[model samples]
Target: SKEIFLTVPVGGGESLRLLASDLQRHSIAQLDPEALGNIKKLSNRLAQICSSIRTHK
Candidate 1:
C-alpha cells in the first residue's frame, strides 16, 4: 500500500506556518465526503480531549 506525507515546516523568525488521504493515490476504496461522514461523527468527540490542541489563529 502507498501513503502520503504531511509536513509542517517552521518559518524563519516568524516561527509559523502549520498544516491524508490517497494512500493509494485515488483511493479507489472510497471518496472524500463518504469517508468524512464517518470522521465527522466521531471528530467532535475526539476533539473533546483536544484541550492540548490550540487554535491556528
Candidate 2:
C-alpha cells in the first residue's frame, strides 16, 4: 500500500484569504452592519494574537 500527501503552494495563506472573504460576504448580508463591523475587529485582533503564538512556536 502507498500513502499520498498534498501540500499547498502558498503556505495556505490563500485559503485564509478566501475564507475571510466568504465570511465577509455572508456577514455583511446576514448580520447587522454594526455587528459585522465588530466581528471584523474581533477577527483581526484574534488573528494577530494567534499568529504571534504560532510564530513563537
Candidate 3:
C-alpha cells in the first residue's frame, strides 16, 4: 500500500485547536457558503500548477 500527505506549518497551538473545533462543528450540514468560496479557487490553482503546469507556482 501507498499513501501521500501534505504538510502545513504550525502557526500556533491555539490555531491548531481552532481548526479542530471548526472541523468538528461544521463540516457537512453547517458549512458557511461564502466562507468556503476560496476553497475551489485554491484547489483549481494548485491542481493546475501541480498537474497542468507541472512547474512553478
Candidate 4:
C-alpha cells in the first residue's frame, strides 16, 4: 500500500499563515464548492479564535 501526506507547520501564527498559503497553493478554489466554502468558513473561525487569544493575552 502507498499513501501521500501533506504537512503544515504546527501551532498558530506562522503555522496558520503557512496553512492558508498552502491551501491556496493547492488550488482549493478548484475543490468542490461545498468543501471549499466549508474550508473558508472553518478558517475564518480559526482566525477569530486566534484573534480572541491575542486579545486576552
Candidate 5:
C-alpha cells in the first residue's frame, strides 16, 4: 500500500502520527486541552472515515 501525504505541522507525523497508538497506550489521565481537542474531533471524523472505508473497500 502507498502512503498518503497530508501537510500537517505537529509532533505527530510518520511514526508519531500513528497517534491512535499513542492514545491506546496511555491511561485516561494527564492529557490536556489540545490533546482532548485533537481526539474529540478525530473521533467524529474517524467514525466517518470508517464508514467511508467500508463502503469504498
Candidate 6:
C-alpha cells in the first residue's frame, strides 16, 4: 500500500498589480474603473487561485 500527500501555499502575502489598461482587456472588467483607480490600480488576481483551492479541497 502507498499514500501520497501534497502541500500547497496560498495567499503568502503576495499580490499582483495589474494596470488599468490591462484589466480592460478581461471579459469581466466592469468592476468600476473608479474603484480600481481609488486603490492605485492594484488588484489581486486570485479568482483562479481561490477556485483552485476550493476545487482541490
lDDT of 5: 0.48
Clashes of 1: 0
lDDT of each residue in 1-57, candidate 3, tens digit only = 143332222332221122422343334223346435544575578877767763565
In model 3, the runs with Cα more than 4 Å from the true position are 1-29, 52-57
Per-residue lDDT tens digits for candidate 4, residues 1-57, read: 144333333322222232432345554444455555666687688798887785655
RMSD of each: 14.6, 12.3, 8.7, 10.8, 6.3, 16.1
Write down the TM-score for model 5: 0.41
lDDT of 2 by residue, 1-57 (tens): 143322222332331222432344542445555555665687699799887785555
Give the number of the best model, judged by lDDT.
4
Residues 1-57 of candidate 1: C-alpha lDDT, one tens digit per residue: 255442222221322111244233333233445444553565577678686678764
Residue pairs with colliding backbones in model 2 are none
Give the residue spans of candidate 2 off by over 4 A. 1-28, 54-56
**Model 2, poorest ten-residue lDDT window?**
6-15
On TM-score, the candidate that comes out on top is 4
RMSD to the native, candidate 1? 14.6
Better of 3 and 6 by lDDT: 3
lDDT of 6 by residue, 1-57 (tens): 143321111233323344444443442343345444433422344454565685555
lDDT against the true structure, per candidate, is 0.41, 0.47, 0.41, 0.49, 0.48, 0.38
After superposing candidate 1, which stretches have Cα over 4 Å from the reference?
1-34, 52-57
Query: Candidate 4 clash total?
Result: 0
At residue 13, give the lDDT of candidate 4. Answer: 25
